[PDB]
Structure 1
Amino acid sequence: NKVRTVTEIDEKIQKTYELAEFDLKNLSSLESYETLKIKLALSKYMAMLSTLEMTQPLLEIFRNKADTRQIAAVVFSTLAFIHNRFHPLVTNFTNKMEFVVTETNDTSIPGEPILFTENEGVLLCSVDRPSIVKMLSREFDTEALVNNCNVRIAKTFGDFSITEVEATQYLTLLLTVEHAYLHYYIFKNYGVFEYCKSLTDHSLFTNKLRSTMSTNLLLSKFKFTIED
């Protein structure tokens, strides 16, 4: 609001300060910092992918209808990286993980192509590679901008192969395995019952995450919805 400060040595002179400018500067710094951090995390992860000797692009990693070994490699890398994200102390996963790569709609559940159901001895990760390719099979509008009027106008008045498109696919896979990692968290914490319940209603993640994660997230930077 308004915060007036009185300065005097009887002659009294009082200045008025508008907190809106302080809020503006604070916000602008916050968005700049958050964007910087997000791009730093993306760069770090894609760099450890580069050190993962993937001489072939990620789309090609999905053209490998047969080679699920590197599919498991990338899945484990992403999952351990997210586990570090919510557990920076831990940089590694439980000893063994098993990987099965589904390849059809009847083997891929809508909404959750990636899943973790135990074979009663250890968790197995079912991922529909064709579904993931379909994720990456859509051209990304990297040409036209996407979206308060006054703040926006004022702020407007204020080398190996990678592209903005590739950054789009990297963000997509990061957030997808992030959602899968949330499901896995519900699993490891509150059993088959609750990871399945989180899968059905993802609102369950709300109450299950105020316990740990809130004490943050890539996607929290923006807020999303559908039109009308």
Structure 2
Amino acid sequence: LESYETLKIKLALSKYMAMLSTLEMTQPLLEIFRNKADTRQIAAVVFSTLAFIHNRFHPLVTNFTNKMEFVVTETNDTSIPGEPILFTENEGVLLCSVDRPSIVKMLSREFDTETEVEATQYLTLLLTVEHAYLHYYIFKNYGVFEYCKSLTDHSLFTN
């Protein structure tokens, strides 16, 4: 029973990795985020992953306003623990924050087991984007302080 579910999960991972490879990034996944200057690759990666997740649970809508801009925050203060990715509002225009130091700490933490390590990093990044899209879904529908509340508690989605 669970075997078919596991196959489907690994298939979702295969789509994830293949989509990332379609961005023509020969650099290792870790070294991509090591480059603080290569913000464009990070931003495009994140937007593509968000659109894919939205598509997976909402296949109807295919295109989204990517006008949201991505700034890689590197100040410890500006960083918000728990949510390395944040979406603000600037007079109707939403931005994005990226804690590259937190990402690097995430990528080099542990190697598990006892190639596949790529898969571990890929799954980690996917879950990061999972949080990102969950709270952004909250805002995109209705967020002013309810989005702030959802930041204070990401479990309101539960399922």
- Return the TM-score normalized by structure 1: 0.66
Moved more, 121-130 or 95-104: 95-104
Deviations 1:193-220 (A, max 9, x none): 1111011022322xxxxxxxxxxxxxxx
Moved more, 113-122 or 90-99: 90-99
Separation in 1, partners of 2:31, 2:57: 29
Which residue of structure 1 aligns with residue 154 of structure 2? 202
Q: 1:80 touches 1:93 (CA, 8 Å); kept in 2? A: yes
Which residue of structure 2 aligns with residue 139 of structure 1? 110
Larger RCO of the pair (alpha carbons < 8 Å, separation 6+): 2
Deviations 1:121-171 (A, max 9, x none): 21111111111111101122211xxxxxxxxxxxxxxxxxxx111100101
Once the two structures are superposed, the pairs formed by residues 167-206 of structure 1 within 5 Å of their partners are 167-205=119-157
Q: 2:51 touches 2:62 (CA, 8 Å); kept in 1? A: yes
SS in 1 for 2:144: helix
Q: 2:73 touches 2:100 (CA, 8 Å); kept in 1? A: yes
Deviations 1:32-91 (A, max 9, x none): 111111100110111111111001111011111112111111111111111112212223
Moved more, 177-186 or 101-110: 101-110
| Percent of residue pairs identical | 99
Structure 1 residue 166 corresponds to structure 2 residue 121: no
SS in 2 for 1:188: helix
Which residue of structure 2 aligns with residue 70 of structure 1? 41
Q: 1:79 to 1:106 in 2, by over 3 A?
A: same
Kindly tell me the number of residue pairs found equivalent between the two proteins. Answer: 158
Separation in 2, partners of 1:177, 1:95: 15
Q: 1:99 touches 1:125 (CA, 8 Å); kept in 2? A: yes
Separation in 2, partners of 1:135, 1:122: 29
Q: Which runs of 4+ in 1 moved over 6 A?
A: none
The structural deviation recorded for 1:104 is 2.7
The structural deviation recorded for 1:95 is 4.6
Deviations 1:16-37 (A, max 9, x none): xxxxxxxxxxxxxx31111111
SS in 2 for 1:103: coil
Larger Cα Rg: Structure 1 or Structure 2? Answer: 1
Structure 1: tracts of 5 or more residues without a match = 1-29, 144-162, 206-227
Structure 2: tracts of 5 or more residues without a match = none
Q: 2:47 touches 2:66 (CA, 8 Å); kept in 1? A: no
Deviations 1:159-189 (A, max 9, x none): xxxx111100101111111011100011111
Separation in 2, partners of 1:119, 1:34: 42
